Structure formats: structure tokens, C-alpha cells
Write a structure and sequence with these properties.
The structure is a homodimer. The first copy, chain A, is built from three helices and five strands; from the N terminus they run E-E-H-H-E-H-E-E. With 89 residues, chain A is α+β, with helices and mostly antiparallel strands. The first copy, chain A, has a single domain, classed as Gcn5-related N-acetyltransferase (GNAT) (Aminopeptidase, 3-Layer(aba) Sandwich), CATH 3.40.630.30. In chain A, strands 1-2-3-5-4 form a five-stranded mixed beta sheet. Chain A is globular and about 30 Å long. The termini of chain A are far apart. Chains A and B meet through helix 3 and strand 4 of A and helix 3 and strand 4 of B. Chain B: It is found in: Cytoplasm; Nucleus; Mitochondrion. Chain B: May contribute to the regulation of cell proliferation.
């Protein structure tokens, strides 16, 4: 198998990933994340999820560009974190 | 012989740095940017500038965490770019 992103389903059929839960110790390599996020996104499409949300603390921003390469864009940012989203259907 | 960050002086005595300008070909190493940013801020602080605003296209987000390590925080982030800031007047 492969990387468990610990996605939380919301009431609108969407799914949320927080990097503070997934990589609590800030030890996760960006390329490995890209690989896990790519595989997760493929899975979440074929189960008819509506959207994916990625919440990324500022010091963990290494995860943004690889997410972006997969379609994610900025929704908003607080001073110390950002939230990215990918619309699915 | 420090790296030129190609800062743009605004009308309020602050500096804008735009990664679309500084690294148009998307070839600049994140660590090299950090070292250059650090030095640039020393210079800007010494010359009494107001603040720094960093504009960073989304695919170039490797530059954020290093900026953050020097005290920058998000100002705004939407769509395919984000903006970071560091207030210099203490």
C-alpha cells in the first residue's frame, strides 16, 4: 500500500487534509508527499468526492508547489498558514 | 558581493520583491534565495526602509518557508500567487 493522508470528510462530500496532523513532527519529504497526495487524489475522484482541502502551516510550505502541480490553488492565507483547494466535481 | 534581489521601492518607503521578476525562469535555489534575502533585509533595515513585500507565484512556493524563517508571514494568498510581509520599523 501507500501513504495515509488522514483525510477528514465534511458534510458537502469534500475531504480535508491538515499537514499538522499528517506531519506533526515536520519530517515529511516534499517529493514523498507529492507521491502520496497524487495517489490520494486519484482515489478521492473515483469515490466521487467533491473537493480536497489542504491546510498547510507556513514552515511546511514546501508542500504547496507539489500540490499546485496537481491542480491545487490558494484559497486563503492566515499570517502563519495557508489553505489550498482542488475542485473535483 | 551579495545577491541582488531586484527590490522595487514603493511610495511608502518599503520594498517589493517579485519572484516573477527575480527568477523568471524558475531556476533559483531555495537556500540561495534565503541567504540573499537575509543580507538584503540587513541592508534595507540599515537604510531605514519601511517593510518588505514578497510576491511569490504558486509553483515557486519553495521560497515561503525560508522567508518565514527570517520573520516573514503571509499577508495574502489567493489563486496562483501569495504575498508575504516583514515590517521593518521597530
Amino acid at each position: 500500500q501507500s501513504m495515509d493522508l488522514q483525510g477528514e470528510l465534511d458534510r458537502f462530500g469534500g475531504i480535508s487534509v491538515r499537514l499538522a496532523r499528517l506531519d506533526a513532527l515536520d519530517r515529511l519529504d516534499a517529493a514523498a508527499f507529492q507521491k502520496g497526495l497524487q495517489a490520494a487524489v486519484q482515489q478521492w475522484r473515483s469515490e466521487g468526492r467533491t473537493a480536497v482541502w489542504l491546510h498547510i502551516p507556513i514552515l511546511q510550505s514546501r508542500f504547496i508547489a507539489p500540490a499546485a502541480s496537481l491542480g491545487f490553488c490558494f484559497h486563503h492565507a492566515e499570517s502563519d498558514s495557508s489553505t489550498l483547494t482542488l475542485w473535483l466535481r
